[PDB]
Design a protein around this ligand. Structure first.
Ligand SMILES: COc1ccc(C2(CNC(=O)[C@](C)(Cc3c[nH]c4ccccc34)NC(=O)Nc3ccc([N+](=O)[O-])cc3)CCCCC2)nc1
Length: 484
């Protein structure tokens, strides 16, 4: 009676997984905008999950209804093989996705993304082949053996992969399964994400929603005059430095040399310099002395809200990044997004981000060179720079979207990993123990609880990955909605 209620829930969840994974694979094949190396691996997963759902459904349906094997040798051997193929694709492809995230963020290459999908198809293909090759033993071991139940003194056909006479081999297979399909892959994923987490950090703060002229009020020219008037300065080309006062990395020294060089000319009076940083006291004083000697220099040695640098970036005409070493270039991307034109050293990220149409590159360590660019900007400033500013905003919002989208992908892959780790550890522990204690019959209620839950947790992982994906990606959700 209430029994005919218990399976219906199983079918509900099985259908949700089948619909979801299928819808996911269909969207990957049908939608060009979503065709990419991460999605190809995710589809690889979705394919592996359907197989598991499909193999397990008759297995589970059968255990609930009858006590005997109803599929025959072919069933007794193909099912373990297909089941185990799934388990490698699942974990190995997750490792491949983790590697993809590492390459995309830690070591962006992509000079010729032409063969990237070509390379990805092969990696997934090989993973399917290796997963099948590792699962070939499951078919050999599993065979039909007559079984006598203590509960009913009756003999039934049984699929049994466990020999009663030989004890050494189960001990070897169990340990290998834990290491090959759990410990080694998760360990590789954790190394990868260690560095991924490392680089996610340099990147923190870059959000298009925040760094935009939408929050600022009034014209840029009007905002600049207000900033200068509060500083007791008249309107002029405004150059900005926001950085720690450190000799080795940021070029506060190079800039201060440059202002010394430019202090002699009649062009200095056309310029205004705001140096916003704190650090070495001697460097801090050189800045203060220049502020006292030159009426066109403002210095700020106090900490400030990203809100107030946002306003400054919009108000200022140019931002100087004289970094002897800048790996990411966050300051330039945030500034260019608000219209500030970067005058930076051609080092690390700055070089890739700043093109000729989007700013001025100088050689680092040359104060004279920096000064000359400052003079160039001065001349450029005479003409309209509105077009350059729009180009800047656009280049920087283009990168900030990829930076943001790839950070989301890293979190989504890690979500997937987490569910897997949690849902598959119990199955591994039960499999190992059983390997040494199969000859003994365990009827303890704890054993049934330990097993009935593991099987449902693993089955849950197969259905949740699409639904999971449905909540972490705005883009996937909209296309999934369209199909339904
Ligand atoms: C929910 O589906 C699961 C749940 C758990 C697993 C395990 C354990 N299940 C099995 O390994 C099955 C898939 C269990 C199984 C074996 N035959 C089956 C037929 C139909 C359904 C399931 C099975 N095969 C197996 O036990 N083979 C085996 C047993 C003993 C020895 N040995 O070391 O003597 C060597 C190999 C645990 C994680 C790592 C390996 C896969 N696999 C699939």
């Amino acid at each position: 009676g209430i029994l005919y209620v218990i399976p219906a829930v199983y079918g509900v969840i099985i259908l949700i997984g089948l619909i979801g994974n299928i819808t996911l694979i269909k969207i990957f094949c049908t939608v060009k905008s979503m065709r990419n190396v991460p999605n190809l691996f995710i589809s690889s997963l979705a394919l592996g999950d359907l197989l598991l759902l499909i193999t397990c459904a008759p297995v589970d349906a059968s255990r609930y209804l009858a006590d005997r094997w109803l599929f025959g040798r072919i069933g007794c051997k193909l099912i373990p093989f297909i089941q185990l193929t799934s388990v490698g694709v699942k974990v190995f492809t997750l490792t491949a996705l983790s590697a993809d995230r590492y390459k995309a963020i830690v070591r962006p290459m992509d000079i010729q993304a032409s063969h990237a999908l070509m390379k990805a198809c092969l990696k997934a293909a090989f993973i399917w082949i290796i997963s099948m090759l590792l699962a070939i033993p499951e078919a050999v071991f599993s065979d039909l053996h007559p079984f006598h139940e203590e509960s009913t003194n009756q003999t039934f056909i049984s699929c049994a992969p466990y020999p009663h006479s030989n004890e050494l081999h189960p001990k070897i297979h169990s340990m290998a399964s834990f290491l090959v399909f759990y410990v080694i892959p998760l360990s590789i994923i954790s190394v990868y994400y260690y560095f991924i987490a490392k680089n996610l950090i340099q990147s923190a703060g870059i959000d298009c929603s925040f760094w935009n002229e939408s929050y600022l009020t009034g014209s840029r020219d009007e905002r600049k005059k207000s900033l200068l008037s509060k500083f007791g300065m008249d309107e002029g080309v405004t150059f900005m430095f926001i950085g720690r006062f450190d000799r080795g990395q940021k070029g506060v020294d190079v800039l201060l040399k440059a202002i010394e060089i430019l202090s002699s000319k009649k062009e200095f009076q056309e310029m205004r310099f705001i140096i916003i940083g704190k650090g070495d006291p001697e460097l801090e004083g050189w800045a203060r002395s220049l502020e006292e000697k030159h009426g066109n220099v403002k210095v700020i040695t106090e900490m400030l809200s990203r809100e107030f640098v946002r306003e400054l970036y919009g108000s200022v005409d140019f931002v100087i990044i004289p970094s002897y070493f800048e790996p990411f270039g966050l300051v330039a991307l945030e500034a260019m997004c608000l219209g500030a034109i970067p005058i930076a050293s051609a080092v690390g990220g700055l070089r890739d981000i700043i093109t000729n149409e989007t700013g001025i590159l100088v050689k680092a360590g040359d104060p004279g060179e920096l000064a000359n660019a400052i003079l160039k900007a001065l001349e450029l400033s005479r003409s309209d720079l509105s077009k350059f500013r729009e180009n800047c905003k656009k280049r920087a919002m283009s990168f900030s979207k990829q930076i943001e989208s790839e950070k989301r992908l890293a979190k989504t892959v890690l979500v997937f990993v987490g569910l897997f780790a949690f849902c598959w550890l119990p199955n591994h522990v039960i499999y190992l123990y059983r390997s040494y204690h199969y000859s003994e019959v365990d009827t303890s209620m704890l054993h049934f609880v330990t097993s009935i839950c593991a099987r449902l947790l693993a089955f849950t992982n197969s259905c949740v990955n699409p639904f999971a994906l449905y909540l972490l990606s705005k883009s996937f959700r909209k296309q999934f909605n369209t199909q339904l």
